[PDB]
Design a protein around this ligand. Structure first.
Ligand SMILES: *[C@@H]1O[C@H](CO)[C@@H](O[C@@H]2O[C@H](CO)[C@@H](O[C@@H]3O[C@H](CO)[C@@H](O)[C@H](O[C@H]4O[C@H](CO)[C@@H](O)[C@H](O)[C@@H]4O)[C@@H]3O)[C@H](O)[C@H]2NC(C)=O)[C@H](O)[C@H]1NC(C)=O
Ligand SMILES: *[C@@H]1O[C@H](CO)[C@@H](O[C@@H]2O[C@H](CO)[C@@H](O[C@@H]3O[C@H](CO)[C@@H](O)[C@H](O[C@H]4O[C@H](CO)[C@@H](O)[C@H](O)[C@@H]4O)[C@@H]3O)[C@H](O)[C@H]2NC(C)=O)[C@H](O)[C@H]1NC(C)=O
Ligand SMILES: *[C@@H]1O[C@H](CO)[C@@H](O[C@@H]2O[C@H](CO)[C@@H](O[C@@H]3O[C@H](CO)[C@@H](O)[C@H](O)[C@@H]3O)[C@H](O)[C@H]2NC(C)=O)[C@H](O)[C@H]1NC(C)=O
Ligand SMILES: *[C@@H]1O[C@H](CO)[C@@H](O[C@@H]2O[C@H](CO)[C@@H](O[C@@H]3O[C@H](CO)[C@@H](O)[C@H](O)[C@@H]3O)[C@H](O)[C@H]2NC(C)=O)[C@H](O)[C@H]1NC(C)=O
Ligand SMILES: *[C@@H]1O[C@H](CO[C@@H]2O[C@@H](C)[C@@H](O)[C@@H](O)[C@@H]2O)[C@@H](O[C@@H]2O[C@H](CO)[C@@H](O)[C@H](O)[C@H]2NC(C)=O)[C@H](O)[C@H]1NC(C)=O
Ligand SMILES: *[C@@H]1O[C@H](CO[C@@H]2O[C@@H](C)[C@@H](O)[C@@H](O)[C@@H]2O)[C@@H](O[C@@H]2O[C@H](CO)[C@@H](O)[C@H](O)[C@H]2NC(C)=O)[C@H](O)[C@H]1NC(C)=O
Ligand SMILES: O=C(N[C@@H](CCCCNC(=O)c1ccc(I)cc1)C(=O)O)N[C@@H](Cc1ccco1)C(=O)O
Ligand SMILES: O=C(N[C@@H](CCCCNC(=O)c1ccc(I)cc1)C(=O)O)N[C@@H](Cc1ccco1)C(=O)O
Ligand SMILES: *[C@@H]1O[C@H](CO)[C@@H](O[C@@H]2O[C@H](CO)[C@@H](O)[C@H](O)[C@H]2NC(C)=O)[C@H](O)[C@H]1NC(C)=O
Ligand SMILES: *[C@@H]1O[C@H](CO)[C@@H](O[C@@H]2O[C@H](CO)[C@@H](O)[C@H](O)[C@H]2NC(C)=O)[C@H](O)[C@H]1NC(C)=O
Ligand SMILES: *[C@@H]1O[C@H](CO)[C@@H](O)[C@H](O)[C@H]1NC(C)=O
Ligand SMILES: *[C@@H]1O[C@H](CO)[C@@H](O)[C@H](O)[C@H]1NC(C)=O
Ligand SMILES: *[C@@H]1O[C@H](CO)[C@@H](O)[C@H](O)[C@H]1NC(C)=O
Ligand SMILES: *[C@@H]1O[C@H](CO)[C@@H](O)[C@H](O)[C@H]1NC(C)=O
Ligand SMILES: *[C@@H]1O[C@H](CO)[C@@H](O)[C@H](O)[C@H]1NC(C)=O
Ligand SMILES: *[C@@H]1O[C@H](CO)[C@@H](O)[C@H](O)[C@H]1NC(C)=O
Ligand SMILES: [Ca+2]
Ligand SMILES: [Ca+2]
Ligand SMILES: [Cl-]
Ligand SMILES: [Cl-]
Ligand SMILES: [Zn+2]
Ligand SMILES: [Zn+2]
Ligand SMILES: [Zn+2]
Ligand SMILES: [Zn+2]
Lengths: 694, 694
């Protein structure tokens, strides 16, 4: 038989291992020849594996690279203008790779050029609350200063935006051992910790879902009209550069001015973590000078798009996508995901060669330039948005399969919760101590839901990966799953060697997953989801799970507002419409579920499958969220303070955020009430798509 | 049998006559008690007639009314401040109606209040070209003047916007006998011409598709957040008032300053048509003073929505809608349309009582507050936009059925051209001299297409009626058809008694259509279209007709640009992408048509019907047109100079319009190139929705 079990049994840990090795021998940076040749290899192999069609879709997008003959670095400069300390020009390469040539040195992609020189201010993680503490409580002014911030907690592009708005003339980002060195484990190559010369690469854009900075709204094809660089979307306005903790210590050790305000501001280096501005008495005449000479350049990128045509509903698409471009070797990010996608395609292709086809079409995607701001997935979705919004059932992401070995981590729409619970109940746990137990059992024990007992935690979707355009812009049900660590306060920081030259095949094979059993478990979860979405007769979406979370999110946003009861009385701020809409959604969803269970009629089936598919699409507002036109989902958006985190009722949340500091409270509370109306209307409108159709 | 012929044979001229009489005995102004009672009557009768459900959908929208105890009027005022001439406070009521009480006096809906006093400038029809002629050629400055313009040629809201941008402090609109008095026919009540005391009412908004000024984007329901009046969408900023030609003559006869520039500026009154500013020598110290005291008021409105559920595809909607609110009695506008809709519902209901149901659901709508800017249809479409865009097959409008007795007039999407040609070939001509001939034959003879011989003229959709939100915002295939006059240069001016108190049942029954045979023919065309759209197995849309017109429109926009060959060389302005997209659309449409003819399989059928239904939807840009976010169709939009007219490739057309007067030609031509890219991309994307789906 050709059922899910046949699909899952065909997946092999050894094939994932072979593919990971094959994908991680040389760098695959977006826009380079090496990454194009890998695209061509994947296209060939996907054809060999049995897909019906495999094409490259290319776009010409803005990328950013350092200048090979004018390197980026930071100095401490004395009063005479002598540079008395320089940061490193490259990461010491790992054993056996000291002769690879095109390793991009650490840089912050899309930094502008400049040579600012000034006094340092240390800003902890440069979060919104860290800048509030500095400016409002400590009365430290960042205007015209160079800020130094530790990586961790939030997306680095939020740090840079926060620093810009504080008036900084430059930003230095560094990896503190408190966040990137787990106690009792050795540095690479002898363990999985970050060495003091290691550096986290990464883009610092604030695109808000736009994709290529030069072509927001439209694919960057051959005839595209491009904005001038001056009007580009999302580019930072001050220079930025990342460094390791050896270099950081040299910059921080001389810092004077004010003491850190409390211990949550101190990392693990042997320095005071003084906030500054500037250095202590003897060194008060020294400054810090940045030298950034990176260039933005329009460059071709290539997505590989494979199709497996559905036997019954070929005009319904289930998409499995993950990226292929990496900062250097991409041992975990993304090749641990891409190797899993490759084995999934191979398994589906094996069933196809035996005469099986899925009910619905499955599309497989190897995205390019994810690391430069989701550019490949976003441009392709802009080009195909009409097909996707009328035909897209679901998107399953597949970036890194492992970021640890402790338990499963899942973020997805409420519509997929029941599908995930059911699938993980049928899969074996790979975990030591849980042999013979289901993955659901181990995951639930190690990652319990805060709300419901005997249930695992599943988080909200924000941004940070290639599902962003499908879910936040187009309203296609989306999910992602990976194996993760037991390190709660680090859930947005990345594993220690994230975006460093040390993320290699050897890292994975020696320290993360020697038997590739976590990779296999993740392949079964991602592949199993895709199989069910593409083959179930009734789409495996449960609208009642949306009703449950909408009530939770309504209670949550109400409680935030209720911290200001006098203003709610004065401006007559009522959440009654929103609770009414949620109650209506609950009632209608319950009746729809009864009809779904209680209807031979393929028109009623498809009519009902269309109601399930368009339910996610009903939460899209075509006017978008305030000043973020490409974030259109009214229930979820990437947090305005941390792109990696999803926020619920984001329009209301942002209207209430720091509202007590607004200078026209009438206007601020007016905007809260406007966002309550937009949310109540959208919840009711979504509920009405589940009513009887006539 | 229950086929189209059974449907059409059930329609009776005598029933339309009875309904028209019933609908036109008292005024039915939007927001009044009388119009609510008519809504309730229609809902009851639609239930009686056999519809499955009939509901009222109500909204609270901004309306505008004169002040009953502070009337609007215009004076000529002497240097002492004595008002030596006053315009009329009301139209002399027609015979037998001199005792109806709630006849709204002539006013311009949404005029602000004011009492401006100044010198007059006559601006012909106040079109964009009339203001160019005045300011650029004649060097007459309108700043701080009161403008007087004749009605006709373009929507009166465009006149007022043009006057505002010229710096006028007020606008007087009047009906010139050249435009509203056909030679050799008598004034009402003895013929169909406008008497000198008659006045055309009408709104002067420039909403650009927004609907209710206070709630753009969202339905004006019970919890809606409203903009403050200061931020309302579309309201004029200077007072405006309409008058008849008796009053106009008194204002124009004293005009001095410059002679009219040519004879196209002279109407039929016995005046010089001097442009001014101000009056001739002896009267040079007299001024004109307006007194406008109308108020904007949020008021409840009621749509009646009837459903006839489809037997096979109940989740696909064919909509027949027209409005019910009128300025006074609405003898032609809209009750000649509403009476036709009522008889259509009655006929469909008769078939239903015999056990028939249409294949698809049919929705019937009696819209409110159309006269105040399409408010009822727009608010309902904002409330139901998720259902409409995923389920809406087509919208057929049904406002006035007759505006003359000469021949048919049709405006619709290219997707309906073949349906209209085929249907009118099967219908009998009502025209004298064409007995025994088809309607297609008479219509083609009297209204030949400019392009193709042996084909009738069909025009583009812009705005001016309730189809606007379904087509321009949502991208639902839309059409309209009525009987019209032989008076080409008056096609946007209205018939002589348009929006006057004299538009009565007697007008229609004595002078337009005594045997109700034109009404019946129009019922067969509108009803026949709805029947075919709701009952055909394959949707009756021909994508090849879109391919043909896209080439015509591309050639047209190219030829406009080619009036500036030096600039096209300098800024490298190429239409190659657009012609490439159109060529691709033609090729793909041809292959799709072959598959459609050449595919028992209901999934392939519905997949194919979905491709036909979503084809119109593919021309929608979710970013909208420049500064008009609610006009989202890339091929068509209401002309920026005349809301009543449709313009093709409107983004490119507006970028090229008057481009030789722009002060930064680099920037202006940049924007032309951007619009060519958006159009080429959208044509290609629409073409790709017709490709094989996988
Ligand atoms: C949740 O679903 C319910 C349906 O179960 C839906 O209920 C609707 O509530 C609206 C808004 O409250 C009701 O609107 C009323 O409609 C009546 C006529 O039916 C009007 O007369 C009412 O207006 C009068 O009263 C107002 C309130 O005091 C006054 O402001 C107004 O000026 C009038 O005096 C009012 O508009 C509607 O009838 C029901 N529909 C039902 C029960 O079927 C509810 O709105 C949904 N929640 C959301 C957020 O959509
Ligand atoms: C109408 O449909 C046709 C398909 O029949 C579609 O054709 C596509 O045209 C594009 C744009 O011209 C082609 O893009 C080329 O793709 C190749 C690889 O396949 C690239 O190497 C090309 O880039 C090189 O050449 C460029 C042009 O001089 C250089 O600027 C560039 O830097 C490179 O040197 C180029 O991108 C594409 O291959 C075809 N697809 C086909 C034939 O299948 C056409 O675009 C459609 N029209 C519209 C408006 O969409
Ligand atoms: C996850 O798995 C659960 C448990 O299998 C699924 O719920 C179950 O789904 C079936 C099919 O709809 C339900 O069976 C129905 O039961 C009623 C009897 O009341 C009968 O009328 C129908 O003909 C049908 O047999 C079953 O009750 C239900 N079990 C529950 C809710 O506990 C769930 O659907 C799966 N989720 C997915 C696939 O997304
Ligand atoms: C308007 O009426 C015309 C004339 O009836 C319709 O065109 C005709 O449509 C039929 C059905 O698709 C075509 O018949 C087909 O012919 C081919 C033979 O080549 C055969 O393979 C199919 O099985 C089928 O019999 C017919 O050719 C075609 N006539 C034309 C184009 O001249 C047209 O479809 C109607 N438009 C509507 C309903 O929108
Ligand atoms: C820190 O580096 C500066 C700049 O040196 C250049 O860039 C470096 C990162 C590296 O690539 C060098 O080879 C480059 O010369 C050093 O200052 C320079 O010193 C040279 C030689 O003495 C002198 O001719 C240049 O003018 C200097 N340039 C500047 C901008 O000052 C500096 O010595 C280094 N400091 C330390 C402590 O090593
Ligand atoms: C033109 O009308 C003005 C204003 O009259 C008022 O509004 C009119 C339209 C009508 O409703 C009148 O009944 C109102 O009184 C006339 O000027 C007024 O004349 C009255 C009586 O002589 C005097 O007490 C008012 O102060 C005047 N008001 C103003 C604003 O001037 C005027 O006589 C009329 N002109 C002609 C030629 O009939
Ligand atoms: O590197 C990433 N994403 C990495 C982020 C690792 C940091 C941990 N962050 C999480 O958001 C996370 C990880 C797993 C799950 I299941 C849910 C959330 C990833 O999603 O695996 N994206 C790029 C590109 C990008 C585009 C937009 C924002 O970031 C970047 O962060 O530099
Ligand atoms: O009165 C109308 N519409 C009338 C306009 C009569 C003037 C002739 N205009 C045409 O645009 C026309 C008439 C028939 C066809 I088939 C195609 C076009 C109508 O469509 O019958 N609408 C209102 C309300 C409105 C809203 C937005 C703009 O106008 C108005 O013009 O005051
Ligand atoms: C990764 O695997 C691919 C596929 O097996 C290898 O590419 C093949 O290399 C052989 C030997 O040169 C050629 O004969 C084939 O034509 C290639 N197949 C393709 C591109 O589909 C590639 O060598 C491997 N890469 C590494 C680093 O091991
Ligand atoms: C228009 O027609 C309607 C429907 O026939 C008339 O309304 C009916 O009036 C009779 C007599 O008063 C009542 O018994 C019915 O209850 C009404 N039916 C409804 C409202 O559905 C109405 O009188 C006619 N109007 C005019 C102006 O002739
Ligand atoms: C990179 O720097 C080199 C060496 O100084 C310079 O000649 C070249 O212009 C730069 N390349 C750029 C800016 O792309
Ligand atoms: C910070 O410093 C600059 C001048 O150096 C000044 O313009 C700005 O207002 C200061 N802000 C605060 C809060 O002191
Ligand atoms: C794998 O799990 C073991 C046992 O709990 C742990 O000690 C080891 O460090 C894990 N590896 C990683 C990278 O987390
Ligand atoms: C209308 O005018 C009357 C009579 O002068 C006045 O008392 C009232 O305020 C006005 N009504 C309005 C502005 O709605
Ligand atoms: C029209 O008149 C006003 C002043 O009365 C002036 O500001 C404006 O520039 C004038 N325009 C032209 C074109 O003369
Ligand atoms: C009806 O048609 C006749 C004959 O051509 C014409 O003379 C008459 O004026 C028409 N009525 C209207 C309102 O056009
Ligand atoms: Ca783009
Ligand atoms: Ca509205
Ligand atoms: Cl992922
Ligand atoms: Cl109409
Ligand atoms: Zn990644
Ligand atoms: Zn990454
Ligand atoms: Zn009308
Ligand atoms: Zn009208």
């Amino acid at each position: 038989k050709h059922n899910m079990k046949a699909f899952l049994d065909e997946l092999k840990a050894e094939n994932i291992k072979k593919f990971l090795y094959n994908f991680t021998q040389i760098p695959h940076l977006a826009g380079t020849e090496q990454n194009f040749q890998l695209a061509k290899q994947i296209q060939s192999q996907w054809k060999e594996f049995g897909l019906d069609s495999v094409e490259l879709a290319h776009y010409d997008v803005l990328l950013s690279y350092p200048n090979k003959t004018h390197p980026n670095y930071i100095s401490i400069i004395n009063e005479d203008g002598n540079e008395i300390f320089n940061t490193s020009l490259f990461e010491p390469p790992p054993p056996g790779y000291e002769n690879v040539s095109d390793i991009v040195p650490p840089f912050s992609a899309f930094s502008p050029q400049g040579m600012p020189e000034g006094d340092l201010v240390y800003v902890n993680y440069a979060r919104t609350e860290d800048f509030f503490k500095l400016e409002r409580d400590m009365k430290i002014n960042c205007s015209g200063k160079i800020v130094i911030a530790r990586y961790g907690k939030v997306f680095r592009g939020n740090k840079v935006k926060n620093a810009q708005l504080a008036g900084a003339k430059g930003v230095i980002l560094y990896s503190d051992p408190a966040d990137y060195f787990a106690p009792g484990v050795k540095s690479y190559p002898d363990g999985w910790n970050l060495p003091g010369g290691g550096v986290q690469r990464g883009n610092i854009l604030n695109l808000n879902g736009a994709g290529d900075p030069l072509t927001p709204g439209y694919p960057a094809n051959e005839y595209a009209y491009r904005r001038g660089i001056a009007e580009a979307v999302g580019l930072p306005s001050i220079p930025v550069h990342p460094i390791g903790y050896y270099d950081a210590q040299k910059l921080l050790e001389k810092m004077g001015g004010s003491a850190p305000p409390d211990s949550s501001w101190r990392g693990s280096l042997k320095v005071p973590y003084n906030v500054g501005p500037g250095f202590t008495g003897n060194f008060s005449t020294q400054k810090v000078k940045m030298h950034i000479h990176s260039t933005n350049e329009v460059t071709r990128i290539y997505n590989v798009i494979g199709t497996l045509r559905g036997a019954v509903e070929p005009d319904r698409y289930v998409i499995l996508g993950g990226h292929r471009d990496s900062w250097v070797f991409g041992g975990i990010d993304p090749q641990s995901g891409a190797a899993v996608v490759h084995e999934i395609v191979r398994s589906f292709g094996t069933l196809k060669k035996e005469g099986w086809r899925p009910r619905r079409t499955i599309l497989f995607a190897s995205w390019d330039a994810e690391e430069f701001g989701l550019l490949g997935s976003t441009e392709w979705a802009e080009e195909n948005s009409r097909l996707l919004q009328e035909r897209g059932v679901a998107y399953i992401n597949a970036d890194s399969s492992i970021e640890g070995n402790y338990t499963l981590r899942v973020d997805c729409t409420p519509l997929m919760y029941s599908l995930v619970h059911n699938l993980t109940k049928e899969l074996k746990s790979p975990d030591e101590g849980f042999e013979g137990k289901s993955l659901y059992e181990s995951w639930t024990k190690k990652s319990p839901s805060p709300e419901f007992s005997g249930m695992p935690r599943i988080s909200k979707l924000g941004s940070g990966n290639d599902f962003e355009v499908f879910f936040q812009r187009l309203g296609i049900a989306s999910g992602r799953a990976r194996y993760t660590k037991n390190w709660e306060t680090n859930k947005f920081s990345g594993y220690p060697l994230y975006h460093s030259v040390y993320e290699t095949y050897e890292l994975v094979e020696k320290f993360y997953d020697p038997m590739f059993k976590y990779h296999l478990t993740v392949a079964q979860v991602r592949g199993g989801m895709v199989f069910e979405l593409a083959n179930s007769i009734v789409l495996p979406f449960d609208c009642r799970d949306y009703a449950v979370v909408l009530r939770k999110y309504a209670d949550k946003i109400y409680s935030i507002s209720m911290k200001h009861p006098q203003e709610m009385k004065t401006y007559s701020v009522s959440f009654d419409s929103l609770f009414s809409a949620v109650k209506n959604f609950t009632e209608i969803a319950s009746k729809f579920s009864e009809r779904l269970q209680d209807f031979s009629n393929p028109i009623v089936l498809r009519m009902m499958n269309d109601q399930l598919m368009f339910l996610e699409r009903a939460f899209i507002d075509p006017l978008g969220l305030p000043d973020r036109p490409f974030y259109r989902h009214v229930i979820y958006a990437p947090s305005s303070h941390n792109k990696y985190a999803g926020e619920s009722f984001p329009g209301i949340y942002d209207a209430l955020f720091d509202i007590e500091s607004k200078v026209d409270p009438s206007k601020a509370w007016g905007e809260v009430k406007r966002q309550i109306y937009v949310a109540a209307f959208t919840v009711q409108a979504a509920a009405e798509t589940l009513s009887e159709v006539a």
